[PDB]
Design a protein around this ligand. Structure first.
Ligand SMILES: COc1ccccc1[C@H](N)CNc1cc(C)nc2nc(N[C@H](CC#N)c3cccc(Cl)c3)nn12
Ligand SMILES: COc1ccccc1[C@H](N)CNc1cc(C)nc2nc(N[C@H](CC#N)c3cccc(Cl)c3)nn12
Ligand SMILES: COc1ccccc1[C@H](N)CNc1cc(C)nc2nc(N[C@H](CC#N)c3cccc(Cl)c3)nn12
Ligand SMILES: COc1ccccc1[C@H](N)CNc1cc(C)nc2nc(N[C@H](CC#N)c3cccc(Cl)c3)nn12
Ligand SMILES: COc1ccccc1[C@H](N)CNc1cc(C)nc2nc(N[C@H](CC#N)c3cccc(Cl)c3)nn12
Ligand SMILES: COc1ccccc1[C@H](N)CNc1cc(C)nc2nc(N[C@H](CC#N)c3cccc(Cl)c3)nn12
Lengths: 157, 157, 159, 159, 159, 157
């Protein structure tokens, strides 16, 4: 059983690590798929986000980190994944995820959308909040893998 | 009885067609009003959106398609419309629509805001989602009138 | 020509309901304020009391008729030759319930249109249930009710 | 190898539940459709009826077993050697309740994963409660139920 | 000088309530933890038990007094010379109910301010109702309760 | 007891006045803190927003208006404020405020986040809605202090 976990991951946080870790305990192979996501004008390049997520997930033996610009339902099919994973935190995410799941079902009905809820520890954070706290000299070491915190400090310096 | 259904309609989808069709069964005359909406930086010009909505609603004999840049409550008064129609899909739309309706009531208390819910078929789509799926080579023929799908493919080509 | 029903429990009818039915009278030639005879939740006021209160409170509106009903609200609309069913929307909890109700009514009677109206900001944070509970705890609810309803609620709570 | 439980009241099982359990069968080797013996709210159908209806309605799915349970759903998953607990998500009210349920199940059994599936748009606005109430008010609910459930609900309401 | 009331059913008081009342003690000179004598929903614990549990659980906080009340919470605040009414906010369902409650309390007592506090993430997914139901189904709830409450809940469920 | 009420206040509305007025009745000293907030690309400069909020709150003897670009939890500590006030209107605000409060608690656990609900009169407005209504020649005199309405008309002229 193969699952894909697609997202912008700009940068990957402990909330994303929590989700991908739970996914590795349920599936034989997990593809952590990083979208180029130019409409979000990311802080980190796609190559930087892939290297960061690779170093942050290296302790999980069945995780493969890749980048993509394709329609996520096509990319799942190309990874031979029958499950597409998304984390669920808040009501805003839930409404967006319902639209995304129904569209993905229309495009690839054999691809199952599965939702996981992160630890309470990460239920009130996002990459966007973390970046803004760090932009204002707020400490975010608790929310990010060590290598990601280093890269975020380096990018803002 | 005259109603106006104002929106960006960038582009008009089957969800909007569903709403305007239900409106034609309740009112003698429906004005489908397309806002120039420059703050949304639309994909299609106002002239293109009016021509698209005109061709998509031509089978409804009591629909008139017009463009506007005015305050929507003034534009309703100018069309001699006593009803302003808006579609309701999700919680996010509902909160926004509550603010819009209360402001419109403050500006024109004799203008009644009326809400319609689209078919379940269109309850998980928006113009923005459709455009992004199409931008990533995803098929959206099911969500749009034929002429609109043609124009969207032509614009992205 | 255009006929609409406005169904509910109205236990009792509040100024929020009056606001909704008044706006409906400006849009439709005839409005039937439809009172649920037997909701699953036992009402404080009997059907006869709820109908009498709603009639007195809407007597100034010439195109409203108050009628009791025990059937499917979609069947009641059809029997009343009403092609529009009106519901008021106040909050997110109302919205989710109204979405289920509207999609079900559409499956039952696809020719019946559900329309939603929003009440004044004045009545957007009240319900019949909140008003009854405040009055039971001896709180001032005069502002939220028609005069006759305020009289009936005081009399009911006194005994 | 991978085992999942899908717990609920299923009073009665609807096409929304069938949709969820069918999708779960495509992801897991074995799925236990787990029926709550004694919910706090008295069910319309007894446990024996709910189990018989769910069995007949899932008989075409080879890797589903229908089982009644009265314990903590997290304890039931562990006793069934299931490391995944499935729940369907339809609306915002479901989401808030499911968040409380999932965080509690994680405190009780941290090795048990809660997974969420979304049903077809066709079943996203129904519930067993809405379907029962529509049928009690003599409304057509055939579209929302497996054939055997539609037969059982008609028979129950007739008497 | 500044006095606040923190009203609720507290059936029983949880670590979520302790979190809220502790934060209130840091902001106000005197905090009255106000326990509802007769809620519409019958409590598991009697008023005497809920007051005794809340007193023992807040005994380390020097500026808290636990008091039972049966009146309008806005009237209770005024009689206690409290110009602030505290409520905890966890989720969207709490938010909608609290909005209705705050606007009503403002109509009843405009000089009374409603303030909202958010509990720790640790207690953001629990309620007294969830905790009681988990304990009734023999689940471990020790982490969510003060020691004395955990003792009282075990004793109540044993008989 | 000292409280801070931080925000963009672009411009300050009657909803914000309502909140700061309620805060003055609970605390000995209230600091109304205006964030430079460049990510929101404000309509008014920080200096203009401070002068507007100063004139609009001059009748409240225990209000001090200041500007800031710092992390709001640090700025609260620097004002010797132990309470950070935020207004709550809708579900969208509530979810955002929950994330903000939990992050502020992580950064400054001794700083208490307190929420106030505005009058029903202001529960359906925002600075953004008011500006857009005014941009479309809609009258917004009811929603703003007199001096703010003058400055908004002057800026759009
Ligand atoms: C409910 O979703 C909405 C609602 C309103 C507007 C836009 C959206 C979506 N963000 C639109 N994008 C969709 C929709 C669907 C169904 N399939 C999609 N495939 C992609 N692929 C891109 C690849 C790149 N670069 C992408 C971008 C960001 C994140 C991801 Cl995980 C993937 N985007 N995409
Ligand atoms: C709840 O609404 C919010 C909340 C926060 C920020 C902004 C808004 C609104 N989008 C602000 N715009 C408002 C508010 C009101 C009351 N009347 C308005 N009349 C118009 N007319 C323009 C005409 C053009 N071009 C327009 C633009 C897009 C769509 C439409 Cl239908 C109309 N805009 N407009
Ligand atoms: C979204 O609604 C839910 C969700 C979950 C459970 C139950 C419900 C509904 N209250 C179930 N009842 C429905 C659904 C539908 C589609 N049509 C209905 N027609 C009636 N008619 C009765 C007549 C009487 N006495 C009634 C009862 C109370 C209020 C009214 Cl306005 C009308 N009830 N009814
Ligand atoms: C978020 O949930 C809330 C929120 C507020 C109050 C009550 C609840 C829950 N309904 C309380 N019950 C919980 C919570 C947890 C964590 N584990 C549970 N295991 C069970 N097992 C029973 C077995 C029986 N008969 C049951 C009852 C009804 C439905 C099901 Cl699927 C299972 N109940 N139960
Ligand atoms: C938004 O609230 C709703 C919405 C719908 C229905 C009912 C309610 C409320 N529970 C109705 N009750 C209200 C409203 C108001 C404004 N003031 C009130 N004062 C009280 N006092 C009693 C005293 C006793 N025993 C009480 C009961 C339970 C909990 C508490 Cl904290 C206090 N109740 N009460
Ligand atoms: C839930 O919050 C989210 C969620 C997603 C993305 C972004 C955010 C926040 N807007 C991120 N900003 C945060 C978070 C935190 C915890 N502390 C912060 N301190 C500041 N200071 C700036 C100073 C300036 N100029 C500011 C900007 C606008 C308004 C204010 Cl009141 C303050 N910003 N800031």
């Amino acid at each position: 059983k193969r699952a894909i976990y697609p997202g912008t991951f700009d940068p990957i946080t402990n909330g994303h690590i929590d989700i991908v870790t739970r996914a590795t305990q349920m599936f034989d192979h997990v593809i952590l798929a990083i979208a180029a996501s130019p409409s979000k004008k990311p802080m980190f390049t796609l190559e930087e986000r892939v290297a960061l997520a690779q170093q942050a997930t290296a302790h999980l033996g069945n995780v493969e980190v890749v980048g993509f610009s394709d329609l996520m339902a096509n990319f799942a099919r190309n990874q031979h994944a029958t499950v597409l994973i998304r984390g669920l935190r808040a009501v805003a995410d839930f409404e967006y995820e319902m639209q995304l799941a129904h569209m993905n079902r229309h495009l690839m009905p054999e691809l199952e959308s599965v939702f996981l809820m992160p630890s309470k520890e990460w239920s009130f954070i996002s990459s966007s909040l973390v970046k803004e706290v760090a932009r204002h000299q707020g400490d975010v070491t608790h929310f990010l893998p060590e290598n990601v915190h280093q890269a975020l400090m380096a990018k803002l310096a």
